[PDB]
Design a protein around this ligand. Structure first.
Ligand SMILES: O=C(Nc1ccccc1)Nc1cccnc1
Length: 150
């Protein structure tokens, strides 16, 4: 009973979380997942500020109200070569990665690793935070509050 959560640098408190190496998070799960990091789904304004500080990914993820990809450098296989906060408009499907926003993180680029999951609750899952540099932090718990996400 294991969940891997790959996380990134934080940029103005915003970071990306990919679960189990696949698009696999629902909007309800995303809010619960960010809550386990004492975080919330970013607002568009928070995401735009993070982008301005150097944040980009090549993965769709929830923010508050939309599913987006922050892009700095045009890449044909990331958000159709767009720059800025690219907003997904048309999709059949409901599961993506998520972004999260931690107000207590540093104001600009924070590329230190994540070494805790401070607000997970008691539960049976081995949850492993996987940093981009491969460093890991694991703890037994749960973060999902909606049965349909389990
Ligand atoms: O904030 C964190 N831990 C913590 C919380 C309160 C007091 C002391 C430590 N971890 C974290 C979360 C989201 C992104 N990066 C790091």
């Amino acid at each position: 009973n294991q969940i891997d959560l790959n996380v990134t640098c934080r940029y103005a408190g915003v970071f990306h979380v990919e679960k189990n190496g696949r698009y696999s998070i629902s909007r309800t799960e995303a809010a619960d997942l960010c809550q386990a990091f004492n975080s919330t789904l970013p607002t568009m304004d928070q995401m735009k500020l993070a982008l301005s500080k150097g944040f980009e990914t090549c993965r769709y993820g929830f923010i508050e109200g939309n599913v987006v990809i922050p892009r700095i450098h045009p890449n044909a296989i990331c958000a159709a070569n767009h720059t800025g906060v690219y907003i997904l408009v048309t999709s059949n499907t409901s599961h993506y990665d998520t972004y999260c926003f931690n107000a207590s993180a540093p104001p600009e680029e924070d590329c230190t690793s994540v070494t805790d999951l401070p607000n997970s609750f008691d539960g049976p899952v081995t949850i492993t935070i996987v940093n981009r540099d491969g460093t890991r932090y694991s703890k037994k718990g749960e973060y999902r509050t909606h049965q349909e996400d389990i």
